[PDB]
Ligand binder design. Sequence first.
Ligand SMILES: Nc1ncnc2c1ncn2[C@@H]1O[C@@H]2COP(=O)(O)O[C@H]2[C@H]1O
Length: 142
Amino acid sequence: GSQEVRRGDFVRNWQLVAAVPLFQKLGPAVLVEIVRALRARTVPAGAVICRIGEPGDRMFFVVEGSVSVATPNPVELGPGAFFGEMALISGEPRSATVSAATTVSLLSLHSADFQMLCSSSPEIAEIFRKTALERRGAAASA
Ligand SMILES: Nc1ncnc2c1ncn2[C@@H]1O[C@@H]2COP(=O)(O)O[C@H]2[C@H]1O
């Protein structure tokens, strides 16, 4: 364990998780366990966060900044948004390539932590499937 002046990273993650209500649906011991499982990591512009084809084994949540999807008809993502749950939702490969348009701070969640947190809250699992369906399709498939 490096850098331990006064759990500054853990404190920042607390406030970071506070920016996400999805994590608020988790109990106290769950949210605390999810916080100790999740880590805040910033991706520099041009840094690929997700690559189509690659298997998703972690989640991503934008805290500050915007992101751009790698495709012919991508979209602009902002803070308070989550992505890369479709894989952790089912296991399918990156539905599309994700690339941070600029330096944005996001949090990382373990696949095991995702299934454990989803097990804690059945609503969070439904919210994920809703986004997975929307992200996966919900327009074409239909
Ligand atoms: N149209 C879209 N808008 C926002 N996010 C998307 C869109 N399409 C795909 N994604 C995200 O790209 C991610 C690729 O990894 P996942 O499939 O696990 O989860 C996918 C979605 O969260």
